[PDB]
Every structure is written in structure tokens, then in C-alpha cells.
């Protein structure tokens, strides 16, 4: 019932003469939640025609690995999951962009969510593809996680969301429990040591991550993301290391699931 892979940590990656930056897609919506499709699509087109565009860095997580702010995954496996995406298709490009925008949305209203799902289904109807089925399921899943966790559906009659990332339900449920037991149960179920420590503030960790490896390499990786219930894994140092590595070299793929 949960054999579902979901794309997480979606950023867009630029390189101007080996100087690299991974950014979230900016927000294209007003304070009430009206999605600016025109500017979004212009952004996506602009990033395609650009030459300093390498793609969306994204990871694939399984449900039992994403603990909201810790990772029950080993670092080598995590590296195998993280890819650099540059599809030869405009609609998949915009889907990854919306994924970025959902993860990094500060506090979306359910109105922006329903609009985003709507635009998504509209893009996915334009592209029959394993990549579009993938981008769509997972983007709806990130959306649903955000609603179910923040009580955005509360209305009574169900909307078209699903349960979201399972351990996010556990994460929410243990914050409710007596302070005595909450602490232990968080330590026992949603704090997987396997990916190691968290850095205090990623940006600094990347700045000295640049100081250490900058004699042989003019490479300089910087990271820009909006803090959010869906971006807590940018605090993890092994994450940031793997991210810099993937953004700076490796390869790109035109198709996630060829």
C-alpha cells in the first residue's frame, strides 16, 4: 500500500563559470493565494533557454525514510537517490518547479494548494510519462502532507488529498503527548542517527565547506532555501555534502524513469 517513491528536496541549480548555486523556485502567488501561472511559466522557459541552468537537484525518498527533520537512510543510499534533472520537456520542468515551490512555501493557504494541484493535474494531462506520473503523485503527496499537518482542510467533506508522508503523522502525534513521554518517543522513532548531525545554519556550513575545498577547485557552492516543514533536511550536514557534490559535478538526466 506504501510502495511509493516521492521526490524530496527539489531545488534549481545554476553554474556561472564553476560558481554554483542551488535555489528554491521563488513564490509566484499573492498574499491571498492566487498562483501566477504566467510568471511561473516564463521563469521555466527562461531557465530552459539559459545555459547556466543544470537542472533541478532532487532526491527520491521512501515513506519510512523521511522523519520530517531526520533521515532513516544511509549516506551511500541517499547519494544513489539524488539526481540532477534537466528534462527535454517544458511541462516536467514546470512540475519540478512547482515541487520546489511547495517544499519552500512559507505558509500556504489551502487556496494556493488547490490551485497548485490544479495546475499540476493540468500539466500531467499534457505529458503521459513515468516522470510526470512520478512528479504528480509526489507533488500531490507533499501538498497533502502540508494540509493534513497544518489543518488547512478545517470544511468536512474530503478534498482530493491523501494521507501524505506517513511519518509526518507520527511526528505530529508525538508532539501532542505528555512532555515526559514525547521526548523519549521522538528520540526512539524519528531521530535516525544514520545520516549524522545537523549543522546550526546550513549557509555557514557551506561557507566553510567552501573554505576547505577551494585551492584545487574554483568551485563554490551556495544554497538558498526557505525554511519550512518540508526543507528541514537542508539542516543535515551529510545532506549538504551530498548536495554540493551532486550539484558541482556528476551528470544530468533528461528522464528520471526512462
Amino acid at each position: 500500500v506504501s510502495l511509493r517513491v516521492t521526490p524530496r528536496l527539489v531545488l534549481e541549480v545554476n553554474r556561472h563559470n564553476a560558481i554554483c548555486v542551488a535555489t528554491n523556485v521563488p513564490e509566484f502567488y499573492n498574499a491571498r493565494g492566487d498562483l501566477n501561472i504566467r510568471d511561473l511559466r516564463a521563469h521555466v522557459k527562461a531557465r530552459m533557454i539559459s545555459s547556466q541552468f543544470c537542472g533541478y537537484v532532487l532526491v527520491s525518498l521512501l515513506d519510512s525514510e523521511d522523519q520530517v527533520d531526520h533521515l532513516n537512510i544511509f549516506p551511500h543510499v541517499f547519494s544513489e537517490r539524488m539526481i540532477l534533472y534537466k528534462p527535454n520537456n517544458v511541462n516536467l520542468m514546470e512540475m519540478c518547479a512547482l515541487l520546489s515551490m511547495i517544499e519552500n512555501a512559507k505558509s500556504p493557504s489551502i487556496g494556493l494548494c488547490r490551485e497548485v494541484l490544479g495546475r499540476l493535474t493540468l500539466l500531467h494531462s499534457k505529458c503521459n510519462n513515468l516522470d510526470s506520473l512520478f512528479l504528480y503523485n509526489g507533488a500531490r503527496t507533499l501538498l497533502s502532507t502540508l494540509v493534513k499537518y497544518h489543518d488547512l482542510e478545517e470544511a468536512a467533506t474530503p478534498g482530493p488529498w491523501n494521507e501524505g508522508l506517513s511519518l509526518f503523522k507520527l511526528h505530529k502525534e508525538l508532539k501532542r503527548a505528555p512532555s515526559e513521554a514525547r521526548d523519549l518517543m521522538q528520540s526512539l522513532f524519528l531521530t535516525s542517527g544514520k545520516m549524522g548531525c545537523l549543522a546550526r545554519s546550513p549557509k555557514d556550513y557551506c561557507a566553510d565547506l567552501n573554505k576547505e575545498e577551494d585551492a584545487n577547485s574554483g568551485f563554490t557552492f551556495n544554497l538558498f532555501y526557505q525554511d519550512s516543514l518540508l526543507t528541514k533536511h537542508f539542516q543535515c550536514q551529510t545532506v549538504l555534502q551530498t548536495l554540493r557534490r551532486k550539484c558541482l559535478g556528476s551528470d544530468t538526466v533528461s528522464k528520471i524513469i526512462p
Binding site: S2, E80, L130, R176, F189
Partner: protein
């Protein structure tokens, strides 16, 4: 494998069924969590309601039963936490 599933790079089969094992176990843990939390909410209501006089023994024993069940629940959670730690290779 024996059946092709649309899989992205990192995902092999072994991770995918390991996922199912862990999702079952933590599904149980989540049920235990929301159970212990409903009971602890009823406890909140008892302990907040006040006004006991001679009816106090009945109320104290009902709190005693609640708290008792809840202890068993939290201990069950711990007990399968450790088991999940026994499956892993580092612990």
C-alpha cells in the same frame, strides 16, 4: 526483478520491501500513539474537572485504570522500538 516497476535511480527492490516491514511496525506504533493520547486527554478532563467529595474514590480508581492502561501502551511502544533496533546492523 521479476516485475518491472517504474523506479527512480536510488530505489532497488530490497529497500522497497524493507520499507514495507518498517511501515507495518511503525503503523502499529502510530495506533499506540493516538490511543495513549486519547487516554491522556480523558485523564486531562478528569484531573481538570475537580469537584470530588465522597465520590472521590470512584474517580481516583477510574484515573488509576486509565493511567494503568496508558503505562502498558507506552511500554509496548518501547518494547517494539527495541525490537526494531535489534533488526539493524549498527545497534
Amino acid at each position: 526483478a521479476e516485475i518491472d516497476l517504474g523506479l527512480p535511480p536510488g530505489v532497488q527492490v530490497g529497500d522497497l520491501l524493507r520499507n514495507e516491514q518498517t511501515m507495518g511496525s511503525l503503523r502499529q506504533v502510530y495506533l499506540l500513539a493516538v490511543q495513549a493520547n486519547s487516554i491522556t486527554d480523558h485523564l486531562k478532563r478528569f484531573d481538570a474537572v475537580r469537584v470530588p467529595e465522597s465520590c472521590r474514590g470512584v474517580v481516583e480508581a477510574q484515573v488509576a485504570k486509565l493511567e494503568a492502561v496508558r503505562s502498558v501502551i507506552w511500554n509496548t511502544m518501547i518494547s517494539l522500538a527495541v525490537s526494531g533496533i535489534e533488526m539493524d546492523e549498527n545497534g
